[PDB]
Each structure stands twice: as structure tokens, then as C-alpha cells.
Design a protein around this ligand. Structure first.
Ligand SMILES: [Mg+2]
Ligand SMILES: [Mg+2]
Lengths: 388, 388
């Protein structure tokens, strides 16, 4: 009913707050086609927040669009979606969708959620709401577009996004859009591990991982992704592993909010720590082997388990292992062979994993290794001498 | 004299300590060529220690050493002196010198010091002492070769080497080999700037820099190199700049010896600190403007006149700029920018410069900033937050 809403009444998504990606819409409008702003920004802008990306949408063949920007630095590849560069600014320019494409209204339906589907045009300063969009955005409601049941089945990932946005923005998930999940959760295991990875970092790294974890668990959507971990929760609720994941997420959340670059390998080596430590002690007694070699074995075990669900890059995995290895050495009350560690490119991680280990296990013996490497890592060579 | 010494009369020097340049010498010997092991390690082997390098000399022309090795990996270039590469152990094979190329007695002549001219042949397990070498190396005396006065004028840098070895091994410089230095020192500003740099680092950044600095001051060899510094020495003997330098050395020494790695950008940024700080006081209290901007000129000046003597690469200077910059940033008690700062690459250095600035000045309003940044960088995010 309320399809087109004008500048004065829409929380002024004030023209001037649009990264000059207007210069790209202009070349479109000034070229016969029409161009719009969708999801990402238009959502945030209308809310109030500082948008985190501007995505334009046009009705120009992904072909015509390629022609109109020969002078421009457009990073090709990939169908429908055309890319354009400036500085630390890249502009997504996707053609509508629907023989394939068609109206701006046809496109508004293939999109996932309501709020993420509001259109803005700089030409008339109006925003088109061909979905609950506006109302939902107002009430703080994440609502899936078509028939939940059907869409989820078509692309199970949508279940994850539905919960992610729900935790990222501070709103509740739509009723008819929430029911299906607990059931269909299982449906993710049919997804390339390559992807469940990509989409997993967008959940926990991204800066809202604590809340997003509170949800991914309360919708059994955590199960499919992290079996190796699910397995160890204690109905109790205070397992030291459980605490570790909660904290490491609150902390990784702080970092991302205070702009501090973060480690993806750290995250995993933190979550999978106790389960690793468990499979370590298990193979120890069940095969009377030496601890250092039992643990060294367990690493391979836990990884190809997780790796089975989340395709983790061989890159990140190497580090992880190291972040763990150091958890051994760093305890052995070492001597003049410690400088060697203080130097490891991973000492920082390893340390911060020991910061936590001592924090959650409220173990005084461990918390000593930390108060020690605490001094020894910031000390100066003279004192660092004596210390050893 | 005693020209040749047998393996039964010369310190261990058992062929089994000669890593495997042996395979480079054998290939020559099998070809009707002379293989002598000369220089550093050949000296050390006698003392007992372990050779840090293995170089070899032969009566084979450089274009001959090329044929008999066209197979192996020759990191060629460099007239004379061919480069054989095993990998983490590269061997140098250089041709005898003189009309151009000559014999072993001829080569032993154009060689700087005594102990650095003993030859060894796997062929007959004998060391060749054409120069004083043996005696010198026993008594522990750094004696030059020909006529001190003329060789120093030939290549002034030779004097720097004189102290360098004098410091490294625990030996004394020969009387005749010393007399000229105080007088001839000034001959160093007639030496390319970039070249001094090499030889400057070869002195301090070599893990002997404390003993080598003292010997550079006692022979007035320091002055020609770091004019910008000499200028602020105080008659009283131990100012704050005069402690800062002895410490940065004693420490950069400690590191190198406990096989750590070391930042040169740091070494300098430390020495030249107070001087910069001095050009700040004047540039400020005169032509009076803001301490920040004043301090910004103080940098360009110091580096300019300092880089007039030493040729510090644009690279190194830029990191020096940083370490200094951070000394103010870190100064002002504050936060939220803190993380944005803790993430700075040259932060590790900056901290350690404050480490010293506090030690030397004994000022408890700095040792205070240290006890802070010290704790703010070892504790995890929950505390790192409350500390602001
Ligand atoms: Mg982007
Ligand atoms: Mg060398």
C-alpha cells in the first residue's frame, strides 16, 4: 500500500551522507537508465547509523553498464554484479533481476529480507518500499521475503543471515520467519564447507559475535557448523570451554569495535582448545603414549573433524597449530631458550590464549605463567636477563 | 720467521670443524688448483672457537673458477671472488691478488691485519704464516700489515676495522698500528656517506657495540661519524645522553648475543634522541612556536646533518621518524586512540625507547608511563578497556 515515501518523512537519508558513489549513479541517470541505492546503506542511513557500504542497482544490461564505464577502473568478473574502484572506495553496481531481469519491483522480491530491500534514488530523493520494509525497520523486525520454508530450502545459508542481522541490528526475528529454522537447521550440512566458512566468519568475527552466538545456539544453528564443539557443552552451563567461547567472543567484539585488526586463526584455536585438550588426555590414557606426542596427534584429529564442516584455509590452520604448540612450551619453566619464543610471529596469539585459559579456569597456577610472561615480554634485556 | 706450521704443532684446527666448504676446496684440489681457507673462522679455529664464516682463496683465475663450477649455483657478479651457494652456508672463493693476479705470499700482503691473514690447506693440513699472525694471535695483538700511515690514507676505513676487531676479540692494538689513528681520524669525512653507514652498523649493531664504542671514543674515531652527537658530550662524563648510548649498546649487545634480532632504526633513534630534544628546546624557545611543530623541524635538521656524515636510507629514517613521533603521542595520558597506537608497527620500538628514556633520566614521571604502557599491552581487552 505505502510504496513510495518522500524525503521529508523518511528519516532524512540526507543526500549529502552518500559517499560520492553518486558520481556513478549520475553517469547512469545522465545516460538514460535509472539507478538506486539498496539494502546495506539505505538500511543504516534510514536508521541513523553511518552506512558501511553503498550498493547501487540499475536496469542496464550488465553489458551496457560495462560499456558506460570504459574510462573507469571497473574490476570485472562475476555475472550481474559489476564492480567499480576509486580509493578505499569500491561501488557495487548490479543489474535488476526477475527474461532474467525486469522491473525494480521484480528485483525487490528476489532479495532476502524486508529492511535489506528498500530502494533509494538520488534523482527524486524518494525511497520505494515494495515490502514490509519500512514498517518492519521501524518495529525492528527481521522478516524473510517469500515463503520462509521454500527460500531456506532453496539456499540454507539464508537461515544464518536471518539470525546474523537479527543480532547485528538490535531487533527480533519475524515469527513466521523463525519457526522453520530449528527444523531446517540440519539443512546446512549440504553446503560446501568452503562457504560455511566464509559465512561463519561473517557471524563471529564481524564485531557482534557474542550476541550472534547467543542466537546461533538458541536456534540449534550452531550444531551444523561446529559439531566438534557442540559435543562438549555441559547441560550445567559453566563448563570452562563454554566460558572460553563466550569470553573470546566478547573480546573479539571489543577489538573490532575499537578498530583493532583481529586474528581468525586465534578465534578457532580458542574455541577448539578444550575439545583439543580433551582428545589429548583421551588418547593419552587410552593408548599410554607420551603426552607431547599424544597432543601432537590430537591436533590432526580435531582439525579434519571441523574441517569436515567448515572448510578452513590451509593458511589459517598452520598458525592455529602453532598458537597451540606454544601453549606447551610457554608453560615449561624455560631458560635462555625463551627469547626464541618471545620472537615467534604468533607469540601474541599464544599469549592471549593463555590470558584466557588462566581467566576462565580461574586456575592460580596458570595465572602465574601470565603474570610472568607479562613482565618478561615488556621488560628490557637487562631485567629480561636476570629473570631467566 | 716460521713460514709453515704442521697440524701437530698448530691448535686443533681438525678438518671436521670446517663445515663443508670442504666440498668446494676438494673440487679445486682435484683440478690442480690451490685451496686455502683464509680470514675470520680460519683465525678462530686456531683460538678454538667456532668460525662464523669460511672463505677460500685460489690461484685459479675467476673465469676458471667459473668453468670448474658452471654446474653449481654461482651467485656470480663481483670481479674476482666467485660465490658458491649451498644455501644457508654460502662459500666464497677468491683469486690471489698482486701483475694483476698472483701468488699466496703476494695475496697475504694486501690483507689488512695479521691474525686475519692465516691460511689453511686441507691439502696438507698446514697453516701458512707469512705475516706475524701466529705470534700476534697468541699474544693477542691487532697488528696492521704494511706501513700503518700509508694504508690508513689508502683506505681510512681500515682504522675503523682496527678498533672493530680490537673490540670483538679481547686483543690490544699494536703500538705502531695505533699512533696514527688519532691524527688520521679526520680522514673519514673524505669517505662516501653510504659506505660509513655499513661500517657504522658493522661496529655497533654487531653485538660488541659497547666495547667498540669506548674504543671509538678513545681514538677520536667516533667524532667523524656522529658529529651531531659528539657536540653534546659533557665534561662531567655521564649526562643523560651519555648513559642512553652506553645502554642502548650494552642492550643491543645482549640481544644480538642471545641470538635475538635487532632494529637499526631503533639504535639511531635512541642515540640521536637527546640531541633532537636539544634542537627542540632551541627551535621552540626561539622563533617561538608550538612544541609539536618545533619538534617537527628538530627532526629534519638532525637527520639532515647526521645523514650528511652517515648515509641512512630513506627507509630507516622513516621508521626513526615514527619512534620519535610516538614519544609524544605516548607521553600525553589519554585513551581510545590507545589501540589505534598499540597497533602501530614501530610501537614495539617506541615503547623500548621510553624504556630507556625512563631508566637513564631516573624520572618517576616516565617510569610511570612505562609501568602503564607495560600493563596496558599485556592484559586482555576487558582490562585494556577499564584502563581508559
Ligand atoms: Mg565493501
Ligand atoms: Mg661476511
Amino acid at each position: 500500500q505505502v510504496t513510495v515515501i518522500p524525503r521529508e518523512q523518511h528519516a532524512i537519508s540526507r543526500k549529502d551522507i552518500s559517499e560520492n558513489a553518486l558520481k556513478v549513479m549520475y553517469r547512469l541517470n545522465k545516460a538514460g537508465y535509472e539507478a538506486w541505492l539498496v539494502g546495506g546503506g539505505v538500511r543504516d542511513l534510514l536508521l541513523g547509523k553511518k552506512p558501511k557500504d553503498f550498493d547501487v542497482t540499475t536496469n542496464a544490461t550488465p553489458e551496457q553498464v560495462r560499456k558506460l564505464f570504459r574510462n573507469c577502473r571497473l574490476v570485472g568478473r562475476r555475472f550481474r554484479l559489476a564492480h567499480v574502484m576509486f580509493g578505499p572506495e569500491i561501488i557495487e553496481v548490479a543489474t535488476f533481476r526477475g527474461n532474467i531481469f525486469g522491473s525494480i519491483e521484480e528485483d525487490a522480491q528476489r532479495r532476502d529480507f524486508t529492511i535489506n530491500s528498500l530502494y533509494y534514488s538520488v534523482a527524486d530523493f524518494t525511497v520505494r518500499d515494495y515490502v514490509g520494509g519500512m514498517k518492519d525497520l521501524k518495529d525492528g523486525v527481521i522478516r524473510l521475503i517469500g515463503n520462509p520454508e521454500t527460500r531456506y530450502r532453496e539456499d540454507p545459508v539464508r537461515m544464518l543471515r536471518a539470525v546474523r542481522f537479527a543480532a547485528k541490528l538490535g531487533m527480533r526475528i519475524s515469527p513466521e520467519t523463525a519457526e522453520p529454522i530449528p527444523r531446517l537447521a540440519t539443512l546446512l550440512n549440504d553446503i560446501p564447507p568452503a562457504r560455511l566458512f566464509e559465512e561463519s566468519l561473517k557471524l563471529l568475527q564481524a564485531g557482534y559475535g557474542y550476541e550472534t552466538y547467543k542466537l546461533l545456539c538458541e536456534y540449534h544453528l550452531f550444531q551444523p557448523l561446529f559439531p566438534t564443539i557442540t559435543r562438549y557443552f555441559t547441560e550445567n552451563g559453566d563448563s570452562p570451554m563454554e566460558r572460553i567461547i563466550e569470553q573470546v567472543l566478547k573480546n573479539t567484539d571489543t577489538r573490532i569495535h575499537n578498530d583493532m585488526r583481529v586474528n581468525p586463526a586465534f578465534l578457532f584455536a580458542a574455541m577448539f582448545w578444550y575439545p583439543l585438550l580433551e582428545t589429548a588426555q583421551k588418547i593419552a590414557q587410552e593408548s599410554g603414549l607420551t603426552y607431547h606426542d599424544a597432543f601432537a596427534l590430537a591436533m590432526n584429529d580435531v582439525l579434519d573433524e571441523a574441517c569436515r564442516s567448515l572448510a578452513i584455509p590451509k593458511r589459517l590452520t598452520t598458525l592455529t597449530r602453532d598458537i597451540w604448540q606454544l601453549q606447551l612450551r610457554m608453560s615449561r619453566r624455560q631458560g635462555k631458550r625463551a627469547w626464541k619464543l618471545l620472537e615467534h610471529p604468533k607469540f601474541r596469539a599464544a599469549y592471549d590464549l593463555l590470558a584466557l585459559r588462566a581467566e576462565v579456569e580461574r586456575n592460580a597456577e596458570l595465572q602465574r605463567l601470565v603474570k610472568w610472561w607479562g613482565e618478561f615480554q615488556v621488560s628490557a634485556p637487562p631485567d629480561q636477563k636476570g629473570m631467566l
